[PDB]
Each structure stands twice: as C-alpha cells, then as structure tokens.
Amino acid sequence: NLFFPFTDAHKKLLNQMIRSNPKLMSGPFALLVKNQKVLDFDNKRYFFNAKLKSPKLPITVRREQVFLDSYRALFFKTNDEIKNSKLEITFKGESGVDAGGVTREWYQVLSRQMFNPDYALFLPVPSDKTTFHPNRTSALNPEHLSFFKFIGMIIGKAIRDQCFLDCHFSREVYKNILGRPVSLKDMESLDPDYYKSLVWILENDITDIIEETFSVETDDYGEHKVINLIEGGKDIIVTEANKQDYVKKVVEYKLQTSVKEQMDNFLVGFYALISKDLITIFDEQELELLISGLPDIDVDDWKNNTTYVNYTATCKEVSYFWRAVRSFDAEERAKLLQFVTGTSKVPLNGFKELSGVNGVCKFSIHRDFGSSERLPSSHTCFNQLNLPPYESYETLRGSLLLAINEG
C-alpha cells in the first residue's frame, strides 16, 4: 500500500529528465529494451524512431481493389527496395486530388481491406468484432502465406513511415510480434467458454469428473485429425500432476501453434522492415498504441455510460476510480481501456455502444469482496473491472497502474 505514491512519481521524474536531455541515455540501444518497464511510451517512441534512421517507389492502384493492387505491385520488389524507398501512391482515376496525404489514406484503406472475409485472412475477435485474429483455416486462399508476409510488411512499413493503421488485433498477435509468450488470460477474449473451462480445471479436483488426453481433435477440412500436444499425448491421460501442463499446452496450440505458419510469414514480412531487437522496446499493450495510435478518450462519455455492480455511483471507491482516471495521461488511459475492454479502440458511436462478446456491454465496475491486498482484474468479454475496496485513493491509483502497465 505504501511506496505506491512514490514509485509512480519516481517514474515520471526519470522520464521527464530523459525528455530534457535524451543524450543522458546514449550507450547501447539494447539497454533501453532491458529497462522498458520504467521508460515512458513517448520516450520509447522517441529512441525507437531515433535508431530507425540508420529513392522513390511509384505505385498506381485502383481504389476499389487497393489490397490486391498493392500486393501485386510490390510482389517482386525486394525487402531492401521496400524498406528504403519513398512510396508515391497514385490512384488510377481521381488523380491529382492531394499530395502526400494519399499515402496516409493509402494505409487506411489498405488496413480495412486486410480483414475482407473474401480473403479468409482474419476472423473477428469475439470480445470486440472490430478487432481481428488470424484465421486458422486461411488455406482457402491458397496464396495466404504470401499475404501475411505482405501484411506484416505493410504494418512494419507504416511504423517506419509514422503512419497509423485502423487495424487492431487480439493481444496474442502483438505478443507474437514481440516474441512474448501467451497467457490463459488471452483465451478470455478469444473464447470465454473455453477460458471458463480451463480455469475450472485448474481450480477444481478433476479426478473423475472430467478426463482428457494431451491431444486436440480438429474437424477441419472434412477430417477428424488428432494432433498430439506432447509426444504420445493421444494416450497420456490428464490427471492432477499434469493438470497445469495440460492447460498450458492446450493454450499454446489453440493460440500460437494453430496459426504457426501464418504468423511466421507475418513476422518475416514484419521483421524485414522492423528488426525484432528494436521493436521489443514496447510491450504487447504499447505495440498496439504504436501502430494504431494513442486514442483520445472522453472520460465523461466513459463515466456517463458506466454501470456499477455491487458498487454505487457516488461511492468512495468509484470516486477514487474517476479521480484516478482523470489523473492519468493519454498512455495510462489507453492501457486502462486495453485492460478492461481488451482494445485501445473507442467505439465510433461512443461508450454508450461499447460492445462485448454478447453485444452492447457497457463499462461495468464490479467489486472484489476478497482481500483489499489484490490487484484489480478485468474480463474483456463483458468490459467489467473487478475493483477491490481500497481505503485510500493512492492505494487504488498505484494498484490500478500496477495492473494497467504490467501483466
């Protein structure tokens, strides 16, 4: 509870001094990666763009089909020709409308065209249908492996060109870009029913109630193919000792292994323009704010479309929460969104239509009841925040920021 008011003020002073004299860092760039858990996102964004500076490429595309045209126009350009060139985008017809602004909207329309179901590239995420995760059955488009490599190439090029993309993904996508491992809490936003299942397995005695094998059956492409999680998992019965390993092995396959090659291609196109050992300055929450951008959220429209369960409006904890939210900066407010709703994207119609797994799930603030010595938790499917009853406002603020940044 104590040291909470200090460690936040300490972090703000360190970053402020680095803004004043960025030469104070100097040295190897890898040291910034090693001590990222204290660096400001804007300072990270600064030193990132710094090391990123160490010709002209004419492209003409039809606005109706900017995805395939850009794909075919850059299909034979090498990585060096794409990493080191100024894209001069032209539209067949509608020519001479504007200058370099065409490139900014060239990225925007290209961002929406990626998720066209006609390509079978991405499937919508259940927590927020406006966010997408890769389609495990992307083999319907037989050239999909060249598409994910093309997509990661565009995402990385937009990062180099300081252009924001209206594309937001599930959290494990950014974690794969950074090489970070997935968690069971990632399964929440992608399949809350399976999450509730796996959580029950880890919480209850499964001696005779449930039984499984270390294998997964996928009725995919008219075949009952059974894949072994571990060697011989088709026959390894799940017990109580291997219970923790089963959930971990299951989550790994259901998330990363089931889309291993599409992600590998995606990373090949991405790492070809943004090296892994300098994109890893950012965590999975900051990486979304790099590509899409920091949102400008309306705390008023947020609190006006906020419900409270086992709490009340004008409560002591609720007063602490909003006095803390309004005391957060753009980075911490964005990560508070990402903590609860799972994304950094505010709905176009406002928080009054904040979507969830079942539909319009407005922002809920539940109550933890158990031990004020826990950090706040969240469920991205229902946009609810479990907030324990904290006595002091500063204990709430530090415990929020401790869950907001970390994870």
Residue numbers in the entry: 2850 to 2903, 2909 to 3261
Task: Copy the relevant paper text.
HECT domains comprise two lobes, an N-terminal lobe and a smaller C-terminal lobe that houses the catalytic cysteine residue (C3235 in Tom1p). Multiple HECT domain crystal structures have indicated that the two lobes rotate with respect to each other through the catalytic cycle of binding E2, transthiolation of ubiquitin from E2 to the HECT domain cysteine, and subsequent ubiquitylation of substrate. The 379-residue HECT domain adopts similar structures and maintains the same intramolecular contacts in the open and closed solenoid structures of Tom1p and in the published structures of human and *Nematocida* HUWE1. Overlap of the Tom1p and human HUWE1 HECT domains shows a 1.1 Å RMSD over 256 pairs of Cα atoms. The HECT domains of Tom1p/HUWE1 family members are thought to ubquitylate substrates, likely for subsequent degradation by the proteasome, while more N-terminal sequences presumably function in substrate recognition.
Tom1p is a large, 374 kDa member of a broadly conserved family of HUWE1 factors (also called Mule, Lasu, Ureb1, Arf-BP1, HectH9/E3^Histone^, Ptr1, Upl1, or Eel-1;). This family is characterized by a large N-terminal domain attached to a smaller C-terminal HECT domain (Homologous to E6-AP Carboxyl Terminus) that provides ubiquitin ligase activity ([Fig fig1]). Tom1p has been implicated in the turnover of excess levels of small, basic proteins including ribosomal components and histones. We determined cryo-EM structures of Tom1p to reveal a helical repeat solenoid architecture for the 2,888 residues preceding the C-terminal HECT domain and an overall architecture that resembles the published structures of HUWE1 but with a larger fraction of ordered residues.
